[PDB]
Design a binder for these strands. Structure first.
Ligand SMILES: [Mg+2]
Ligand SMILES: [Mg+2]
Ligand SMILES: [Mg+2]
Ligand SMILES: [Mg+2]
Ligand SMILES: [Mg+2]
Ligand SMILES: [Mg+2]
Ligand SMILES: [Mg+2]
Ligand SMILES: [Mg+2]
Ligand SMILES: [Mg+2]
Ligand SMILES: [Mg+2]
Ligand SMILES: [Mg+2]
Ligand SMILES: [Mg+2]
Ligand SMILES: [Mg+2]
Ligand SMILES: [Mg+2]
Ligand SMILES: [Mg+2]
Ligand SMILES: [Mg+2]
Ligand SMILES: [Mg+2]
Ligand SMILES: [Mg+2]
Ligand SMILES: [Mg+2]
Ligand SMILES: [Mg+2]
Lengths: 292, 159, 208, 172
RNA sequence: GAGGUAAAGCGAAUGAUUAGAAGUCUUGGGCUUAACUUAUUCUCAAACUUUAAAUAUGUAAGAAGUCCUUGUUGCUUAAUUGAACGUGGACAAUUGAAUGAAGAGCUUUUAGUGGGCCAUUUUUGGUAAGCAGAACUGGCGAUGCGGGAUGA
RNA sequence: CCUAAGGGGGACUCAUGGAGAACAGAAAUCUCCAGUAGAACAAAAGGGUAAAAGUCCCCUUGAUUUUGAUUUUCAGUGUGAA
RNA sequence: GGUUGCGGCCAUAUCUAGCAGAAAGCACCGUUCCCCGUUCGAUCAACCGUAGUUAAGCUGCUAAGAGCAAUACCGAGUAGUGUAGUGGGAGACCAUACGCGAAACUAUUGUGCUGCAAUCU
């Protein structure tokens, strides 16, 4: 009764979007605004702090874009944190802060700007930007790229922001998206921000849940229970981790249990292979014959 | 009433290519232009800022100025009995590097390499390009290729 | 009313069709393009005879109507109304203009009539019939030729009816099960697409 | 693999939407909103007419209808309270091809709430959107995709699930 | 490099359009007609189009070039990065396609003119016109001479 | 003609069709699916635009100051506009 | 080789209908004290990685698949066209000479390639 829509003309005239837009992964509007560089700064690249959250991991990368593809400068993942002493809550706002601090320290070590631009060595939660030192190189400038993730006051991407800013990178930002920002009275409550930096919210949940719902405390905070980690010593886990991250921010790759060839040979066993033209012609001939 | 507006007659010139509408791929914004570069001008209809006039659509020129998002291009236009130097400000979406530079610069590199190697081998080489010359003599073998005789065909109607 | 056709014989202007730009255009005199037994199957009328243009020219809708009527009347009178299927292959889509119906000021004309722009070798009329009805169909077209200006040729087609296949390739594809009826026309077998649907639609398909 | 008796293929209610399309604006619509807030415990939202129709007495952007969306156990409670009014007998023609179903009560006191002369009686519309786990794929911002054909909810599956879960009847 | 005219296309979008056939009417009436849907069919577009010429058109084919080394700045870079302009060094007449070149470049000053017309080809209005209006070129005007008997 | 129909940011996706829901029916409101834009973008027409240039929301005055360069029409004068 | 993050070109990558998927990743998935946003913790925010699952997403494979791309003793040196004649023809138009040269059609083949970082039976 109604016209069939998916005609051959519909498919012929359909213009498919960009591959990574159809994947729903790249916002090319924002990407153009982030990447495009002043034409009189000819080959000087703009550096992005790409911050992406998965269900289990925090990915922070410093990236510059080129015609053949993006090039990673350094990268810090949340699963590197256990090396530094954070094994649980690998997606906290505080885990985000630690990852941002780690990527900042690693980038500055790679560049050579360690003694200059140390950052906020005494984290009190105050809003601060990395100021340049007179008669010295300017701080490494990086712009935050949160991708498709929504901008909300209290979001974890700005946790990675705050960690990277305190780590010595100059990343331009405002404090009105941090946890503890009073929108009515436009000032930042640094006490609550420091709480979030050192897992204060998580510790308060532990304390509030333990005396109200012990069974839920046992299921949600199992790993802490078998690790004998209470609320009062939650903060120290981060406070030490910070210090260790500043002590040795260098990247240590995981020792690989197999070689590239072994990985490839194992994976190739589970990969279906395309039928040859002759094979599918033979299948067609067989189906015709069995159709008589 | 005659109409001679800025974009008159650009109905097809300023159209996007079929199945090529929408966002600009970012290699356009990643290319680097220096003063003295030779660039083609091709208006992109989806960017209306910094758009060239229809005369410069399809022209090639020299970059003379580099600004935040644009380049200044020098074009020579015939006005009566002489050329006038025109200075056009174009956003980089309407600009592309000219491919004639890389070919001539490659012939320069190849000539330098051939001349130095010929000097190393102690011989001489001629570097001037040559037009296609008439072909030389040749012998056509007919083993397996004995000439087939054709004739004009009679008239037929095929409808 | 109507000027002599000589005033509009030649394709001097660009095509001027009905559009959103000219709207008050009269109708063509020809409205019927298929006559005779238009529902006959392809196998019933193997012989095709064409009236072909040897002119780059314009034919009015009035001439198209007159020739259609003349050919139809003669062929139905001599051989019966169901012994043929006549098709007029040119549609008048070009609007002629008339000025008088001051001086040369504002002389852009008003729609006056419709004409078909025909090329050299363009088919004007096609008549599919049986072989035994050749001389009749030919004389029907030869009479219709008088209603047209210029030179036209009566050409006996090499093909089966209104199909694009010769009278031997059609028989080969018919005995090979590659042709099925579609009412007045046929559908041909394709070696592309869904194999099962192709086989179902052409059951007698002797695959090689 | 691809086993139909998988845990994640379980049908369950996504949302229940309660609609009262009072044809006018003002006191009647306000009292209908009061009824909806009473039943659901949630502030309802008023919908405006998309265009003007003189026959129906509505105009564009005039607040006409009121509706509310409930999810979870509260949706289940309201749905079974309404199925009591329907005496657990829907029609085969109450289920859409996409696996959703709906019915409409005519008096809101049949649901089991107290009647007030000031409020009056409003009829009400119930619609239940069915869905399995993984529907977040079609609603999330990043990497949004479509649901595979086998994981989709359809009319036959929804009818069978309704008959099993409510011991009710679907009048074919 | 650019182009969207000729051609082509319409079982490709838009718009126009001839004919049957098979289904659905469940939201048309009296087996029936008419609607739609599906696969087909005839014919079209200066102000339609996926495609797309020929002719015409932009740029380049070096010494003011290419490569190597390292100076200036308040611009620019996280930078010791660049941008521009440079010092110093190497590559010599096949110095980097053809053909031609009563030489190239530059300046001042002033006359007449600012009714045009014709032919081929492209082309608009008009039934057409030794009609009216455009495109490119060549002519007449401004030009005699041989031919078209005669004739811008 | 417009204090937004200007500027910035964010969120959302349009025309239309199908299948469903009391009154409710061809057209009210609700839901899902399909939907390359077949919608919309002040006004002619053409071009352009889909995580937007469209719809809705938040904040605003870059519709500000200074005087040069350039493009179009062009005599390479003015005006307008960019 | 698989996978993820960020990409380049932007369908050989899209679309429809099926099937398979080890490891890790990704994902769905669980919860609402806290920052935050909603008619609705569905989306968005936060928390746990603890209770579960490859069902879906994703990836690959299948189809005389639609589409798309490429190629060509396919059509066709056809249509068109630059240049020429005191060529033909009443004309409409056409042929010839020196050059350039399509589109549809037909057939065949293919169905993402790839850069940086990290990771994995
Ligand atoms: Mg954004
Ligand atoms: Mg174009
Ligand atoms: Mg503007
Ligand atoms: Mg004319
Ligand atoms: Mg044009
Ligand atoms: Mg044409
Ligand atoms: Mg074509
Ligand atoms: Mg068409
Ligand atoms: Mg004078
Ligand atoms: Mg004068
Ligand atoms: Mg005068
Ligand atoms: Mg004179
Ligand atoms: Mg003379
Ligand atoms: Mg003489
Ligand atoms: Mg004479
Ligand atoms: Mg606007
Ligand atoms: Mg605004
Ligand atoms: Mg926006
Ligand atoms: Mg000027
Ligand atoms: Mg001006």
């Amino acid at each position: 009764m109604q016209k069939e829509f998916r005609t051959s003309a519909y498919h012929s005239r359909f213009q498919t979007p960009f591959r990574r837009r159809q994947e729903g992964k790249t916002d090319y509007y924002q990407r153009k605004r982030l990447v495009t560089q002043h034409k009189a700064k000819y080959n000087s690249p703009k550096y992005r702090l790409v911050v992406r959250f998965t269900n289990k991991d925090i990915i922070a990368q410093i990236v510059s874009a080129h015609i053949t593809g993006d090039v990673v400068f350094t990268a810090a993942y949340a699963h590197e944190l256990p090396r530094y002493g954070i094994k649980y809550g690998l997606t906290n706002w505080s885990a985000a802060y630690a990852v941002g601090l780690l990527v900042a320290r690693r980038a500055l070590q790679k560049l050579g700007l360690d003694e200059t631009y140390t950052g906020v060595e005494e984290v009190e939660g105050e809003f601060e930007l990395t100021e340049a030192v007179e008669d010295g190189p300017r701080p490494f400038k990086v712009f935050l790229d949160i991708g498709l993730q929504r901008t909300t006051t209290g979001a974890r991407v700005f946790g990675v922001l705050k960690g990277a800013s305190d780590g010595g990178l100059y990343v331009p930002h405002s404090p009105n998206r941090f946890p503890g920002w009073d929108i009515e009275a436009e000032e930042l409550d640094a006490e609550l921000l420091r709480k979030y930096i050192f897992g204060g919210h998580v510790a308060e949940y532990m304390e509030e849940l333990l005396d109200d719902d012990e069974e839920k405390y046992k299921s949600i905070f199992k790993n802490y229970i078998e690790e004998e980690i209470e609320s009062e010593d939650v903060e120290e886990i981060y406070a030490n981790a910070h210090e260790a991250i500043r002590a040795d921010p260098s990247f240590k790759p995981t020792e690989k249990k197999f070689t590239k060839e072994q990985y490839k040979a194992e994976s190739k066993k589970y990969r279906q292979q395309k039928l040859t033209r002759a094979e599918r012609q033979a299948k067609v001939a067989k189906k015709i014959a069995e159709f008589k | 009433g005659k109409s001679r507006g800025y974009r008159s007659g650009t109905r097809y010139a300023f159209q996007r290519d079929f199945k090529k509408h929408g966002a600009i791929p970012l290699s356009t914004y990643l290319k680097v232009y220096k003063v003295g570069d030779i660039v083609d001008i091709k208006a992109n209809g989806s960017i209306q800022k910094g758009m060239p006039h229809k005369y410069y659509h399809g022209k090639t020129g020299i970059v003379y100025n580099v600004t935040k998002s644009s380049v200044g291009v020098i074009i020579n236009k015939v006005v009566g009995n002489r050329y006038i130097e025109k200075r056009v400000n174009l956003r980089v979406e309407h600009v592309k590097h000219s491919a004639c530079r890389q070919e001539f610069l490659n012939r320069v590199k190849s000539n330098a390499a051939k001349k130095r190697e010929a000097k190393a081998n102690g011989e001489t080489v001629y570097l001037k390009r040559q037009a296609a010359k008439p072909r030389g003599s040749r012998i056509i073998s007919t083993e397996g290729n004995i000439p087939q005789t054709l004739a004009p065909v009679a008239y037929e109607t095929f409808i | 009313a109507r000027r002599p056709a000589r005033c509009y014989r030649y394709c001097k202007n660009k095509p001027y069709p009905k559009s959103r730009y000219n709207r008050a255009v009269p109708d063509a005199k020809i409205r019927i393009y298929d006559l005779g037994r238009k529902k006959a199957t392809v196998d019933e009328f193997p012989l095709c005879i064409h009236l072909v243009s040897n002119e780059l020219e314009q034919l009015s809708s009035e001439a198209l109507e007159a020739a259609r009527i003349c050919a139809n009347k003669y062929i139905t009178k001599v051989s019966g109304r169901d012994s043929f299927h006549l098709r007029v292959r040119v549609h008048p889509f070009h609007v002629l203009r008339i000025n008088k119906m001051q001086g040369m000021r504002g002389a852009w004309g008003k729609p006056h009539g419709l004409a078909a722009r025909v090329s050299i070798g363009q088919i004007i009329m096609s008549a599919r019939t049986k072989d035994s009805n050749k001389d009749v169909v030919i004389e029907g077209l030869r009479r219709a030729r008088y209603k047209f200006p210029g030179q036209q040729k009566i050409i006996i087609s090499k093909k089966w009816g209104f199909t694009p296949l010769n009278r031997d390739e059609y028989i080969a594809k018919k005995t090979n099960g590659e042709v099925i009826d579609d009412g007045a026309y046929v559908k041909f077998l394709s070696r592309k697409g869904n194999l099962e649907a192709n086989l179902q639609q052409f059951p007698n398909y002797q695959y090689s | 693999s691809d086993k139909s008796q998988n845990v994640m293929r379980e049908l369950r209610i996504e949302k229940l939407v309660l609609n009262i399309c009072v044809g006018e604006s003002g006191d009647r619509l306000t009292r209908a909103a009061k009824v909806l807030e009473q039943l659901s415990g949630q502030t309802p939202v008023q919908s405006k007419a998309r265009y003007t129709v003189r026959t129906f007495g509505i105009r564009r952007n005039e607040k006409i209808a009121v509706h509310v969306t409930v999810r979870g156990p509260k949706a289940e409670e309201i749905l079974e309270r309404g199925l009591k009014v329907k005496e657990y007998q829907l029609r085969s023609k109450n289920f859409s091809a996409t696996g959703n179903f709906g019915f409409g009560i005519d008096e809101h006191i049949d649901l089991g709430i107290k009647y007030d002369p000031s409020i009056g009686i409003y009829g009400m519309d119930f619609y239940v959107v069915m869905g399995r786990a993984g529907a977040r794929v079609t609603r999330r911002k990043r990497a949004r995709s479509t649901i595979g054909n086998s994981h989709k909810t359809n009319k036959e599956d929804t009818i069978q699930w309704f008959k099993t879960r409510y011991d009710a009847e679907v009048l074919d």
